[PDB]
């Protein structure tokens, strides 16, 4: 029951068995005893490194601003960002370099990220806006139908006066500004938690599923339902980026486990509403934006539900090219008047 309620503690005995188990129960030795799961901070998800492996140069520590590198390693080829780096109002104000991986679980080289894309420090308000929009859009609006008194023909059988209706339900409209902001903040949150992995290509030797499973096993990708899921952003590679997905990998990624491939973009189309005043009566579907966001986009809900985030260098290049003009327009005038000067 409620905490401040008399019905909260009237079960004063019997909830526990006096005799303990002989296989799993044990006694508390003392302060030097390490209890399984004990932690001072409230962790509703007590996942640790071994259970949920993080892939990053360093374990995220309070001393380090971000768990990735801060300077290019002299023993690895360094690849600068495709578009020049600008630090905006929300950027981390620090250089970020990710150790790109190969399909053989080996670090190939190190590629610099973008602080505007992977440096926008996350914020709970925007993350919650994204999550709420996604969870209110993904619900099925065609199943919200209910009877009415004029629809019931001869109280119990007589329907309600104002029942729920597919058209009466609401589908909200979200602006591309907040959408891109929330997606960038989610990418930065993944980077800070240290579960972002950059691969050169996502290509299978055969379009079947056993080759996909063999690839995941070789590079230690946990795909099971119970284990930590995977979120792919396939875009091709660095030299040959493609907006569409690779055909072989797109055919092979259909596994029952927790793995989802999404389109390599963080923006969205501007949602329109041509039935704002309920002009067309025979329209079926919820009021609001008639052009919702498809499922194969990057989103806070799927990013939280899937443990690891594997982005491709083609996706990186496409995101940078799509956010270049935005991060250039956001700049104040006394800064943007110097862009042609610096080149």
């Amino acid at each position: 029951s409620s905490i401040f309620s008399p019905r909260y503690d009237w079960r004063t005995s019997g909830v526990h068995d006096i005799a303990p188990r002989d296989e799993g129960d044990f006694l508390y030795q003392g302060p030097q005893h390490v209890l399984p799961g004990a932690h001072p901070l409230p962790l509703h998800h007590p996942h640790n490194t071994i259970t949920r492996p993080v892939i990053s140069p360093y374990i995220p520590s309070p001393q380090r601003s971000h768990p990735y590198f801060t300077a290019p390693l002299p023993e690895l080829p360094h690849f600068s960002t495709t578009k020049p780096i600008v630090y905006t109002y929300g950027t981390m104000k620090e250089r970020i370099i990710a150790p790109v991986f190969n399909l053989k679980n080996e670090v190939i080289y190190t590629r610099e990220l973008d602080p505007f894309i992977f440096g926008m420090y996350p914020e709970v308000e925007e993350l919650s806006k994204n999550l709420t929009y996604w969870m209110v859009r993904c619900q099925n609006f065609a199943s919200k139908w209910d009877y009415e008194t004029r629809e019931i023909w001869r109280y119990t059988w007589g329907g309600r006066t104002k029942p729920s209706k597919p058209w009466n339900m609401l589908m909200p409209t979200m602006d591309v500004k907040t959408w891109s902001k929330s997606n960038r903040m989610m990418l930065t949150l993944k980077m800070l938690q240290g579960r972002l992995q950059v691969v050169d290509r996502l290509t299978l030797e055969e379009p079947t599923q056993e080759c996909y499973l063999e690839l995941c096993r070789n590079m230690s990708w946990d795909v099971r339902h119970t284990g930590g899921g995977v979120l792919f952003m396939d875009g091709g590679s660095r030299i040959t980026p493609s907006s569409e997905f690779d055909r072989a990998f797109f055919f092979g990624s259909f596994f029952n486990g927790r793995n989802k491939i999404v389109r390599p973009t963080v923006l969205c189309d501007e949602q329109y509403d041509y039935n704002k005043t309920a002009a067309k009566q025979r329209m079926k579907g919820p009021k609001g934006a008639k052009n919702p966001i498809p499922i194969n986009r990057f989103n806070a809900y799927d990013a939280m539900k899937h443990d690891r985030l594997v982005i491709t260098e083609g996706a990186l290049m496409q995101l940078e090219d799509e956010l270049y003009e935005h991060k250039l327009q956001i700049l104040p005038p006394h800064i943007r008047n110097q862009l042609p000067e610096y080149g």
């Binding site: 004029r150 629809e151 019931i152 023909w153 058209w167 005043t277 309920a278 067309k280 025979r282 329209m283």
Partner: peptide, 13 residues
């Protein structure tokens, strides 16, 4: 079975 089904209501001016 089947009776007079209610449709979407037009908004006011």
């Amino acid at each position: 079975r089947k009776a007079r089904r209610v449709q979407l209501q037009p908004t006011e001016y």
